[PDB]
C-alpha cells in the first residue's frame, strides 16, 4: 500500500533526523543553537495513529511486514524515549502509546516478529524503562508488548527478555499498579516470563514483598481483585512454586499469607484456570515439608485432591494425583492408626 509506504517513510525520515541530531548535538550550548526535533512539528502522532489502526487487520500487517514496519515503529518509540525520557508531555505519551499498540498487534501470533523486536535490544531497554512512567495507560501498553514477546519466546528471545531486566521491572511495576486493566497486562506478561527458566522464577521471588503480593492476588475476599487477576497471579505462583518448594524462607512467606488455605479454596472454584493453577502449586508445595503436609491433612486436602484425579485436564489430573501421592507418602503422626489409637 502506497499510503502505508508513505507513512512508514515519514516515520523513518523522522527517526533519521533524530539520530543525526543526537550525533551533532554538543553539550553546554543554547536551546536555540541546534534545536531538538519535536515530533508535533513532523505530524508524527497522526502517522503512528493511522499505522496503529491499520495494524489490527492481518492483511494490513502482512503489508507492513513486507515494508519493514515493525522496525520503523520500534525505532520511533525508542528514539522518543531516549530523547525525552520519562515525560508527562501528552503528545509524547500518546505517540508512545500508539507505537506500542502497533507493536503489540504486529507481534501477535507472529513468531518472526517477536524474535525481531527482541533482537532490537536498545528498543527493549527503552520499553522496560517506560514501566516507570506515571501513565498507567502507557504501563499497560508496554506490559502488553512484553506479554506478546514472552509468549512462545525462542531461545534467544528468552535470553534477551531476561537480560534487559523485564522480570524485575514488571514485578516492581505490579506492586504499585492501581488500575486493574494495567495490572492484568503486567501479571499476564509475568505469567509468561515466569515459565521461561528458573532464573526468572528466582528474580520474581527476590523482589521485596513480591511473594506476599502474589498470594494477595489469589484471594476472593478483595475489593480490587477480579477473576483475571486471580488467574494470572495464581499462574505466576504455579510457575515459581517449583523453586519455592525448595526454599524454607519463601515457604514461610507463603505460610504466613495463608497460601495453603487459599489454594484449597481454589480447588473448589468453578474457574478451570484457577483450579488448574492450584493443582500445580499444591503438587510442588506438598513435597518435602512436614509442616505444610500436616496443615494440608488438617484442612481436608486428601479428599479434595482425590476428587480431581479423573479430570480430562492434564494439569488438574496430574497435579491433584501427585499432590495426593505426596500427602499419602508423608502421613503426619497424628493421622497414623497407632496415634488416633
Amino acid at each position: 500500500h502506497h499510503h502505508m509506504l508513505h507513512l512508514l517513510e515519514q516515520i523513518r525520515a523522522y527517526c533519521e533526523t533524530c539520530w543525526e541530531w543526537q550525533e551533532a548535538h554538543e553539550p553546554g550550548m543554547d536551546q536555540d543553537k541546534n534545536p531538538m526535533p519535536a515530533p508535533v512539528e513532523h505530524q508524527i502522532c497522526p502517522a503512528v495513529c493511522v499505522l496503529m489502526k491499520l495494524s489490527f487487520d492481518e492483511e494490513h500487517r502482512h503489508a507492513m511486514n513486507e515494508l519493514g514496519g515493525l522496525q520503523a515503529i520500534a525505532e520511533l518509540l525508542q528514539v522518543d524515549c531516549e530523547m525525552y525520557g520519562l515525560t508527562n508531555d501528552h503528545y509524547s505519551i500518546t505517540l508512545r502509546r500508539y507505537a506500542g499498540m502497533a507493536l503489540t498487534n504486529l507481534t501477535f501470533g507472529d513468531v518472526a516478529n517477536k524474535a525481531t523486536l527482541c533482537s532490537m535490544k536498545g528498543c527493549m531497554r527503552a520499553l522496560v524503562a517506560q514501566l516507570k512512567s506515571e501513565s498507567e495507560d502507557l504501563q499497560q501498553v508496554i506490559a502488553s508488548v512484553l506479554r506478546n514477546l514472552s509468549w512462545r519466546a525462542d531461545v534467544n528471545s528468552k535470553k534477551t527478555l531476561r537480560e534487559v531486566g523485564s522480570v524485575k521491572a514488571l514485578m516492581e511495576c505490579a506492586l504499585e499498579v492501581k488500575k486493574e486493566s494495567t495490572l492484568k497486562s503486567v501479571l499476564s506478561a509475568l505469567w509468561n516470563l515466569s515459565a521461561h527458566c528458573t532464573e526468572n522464577k528466582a528474580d520474581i521471588c527476590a523482589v521485596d514483598g513480591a511473594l506476599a503480593f502474589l498470594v494477595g492476588t489469589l484471594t476472593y475476599r478483595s475489593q480490587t481483585n477480579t477473576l483475571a487477576i486471580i488467574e494470572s497471579g495464581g499462574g505466576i505462583l504455579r510457575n515459581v512454586s517449583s523453586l519455592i518448594a525448595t526454599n524454607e524462607d519463601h515457604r514461610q512467606i507463603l505460610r504466613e499469607n495463608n497460601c495453603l488455605q487459599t489454594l484449597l479454596q481454589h480447588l473448589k472454584s468453578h474457574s478451570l484456570t484457577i483450579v488448574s493453577n492450584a493443582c500445580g502449586t499444591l503438587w510442588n508445595l506438598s513435597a518435602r515439608n512436614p509442616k505444610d503436609q500436616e496443615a494440608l491433612w488438617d484442612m481436608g486436602a486428601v479428599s479434595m485432591l482425590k476428587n480431581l484425579i479423573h479430570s480430562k485436564h492434564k494439569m488438574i489430573a496430574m497435579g491433584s494425583a501427585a499432590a495426593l501421592r505426596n500427602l499419602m507418602a508423608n502421613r503426619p503422626a497424628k493421622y497414623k492408626d497407632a496415634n488416633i489409637m
Binding site: 496503529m52 506500542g100 499498540m101 503489540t104 506479554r147 505469567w191
Partner: peptide, 7 residues
C-alpha cells in the same frame, strides 16, 4: 498468560 491484540 498467552498473547492478545492491543486496545
Amino acid at each position: 498468560g498467552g498473547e492478545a491484540l492491543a486496545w
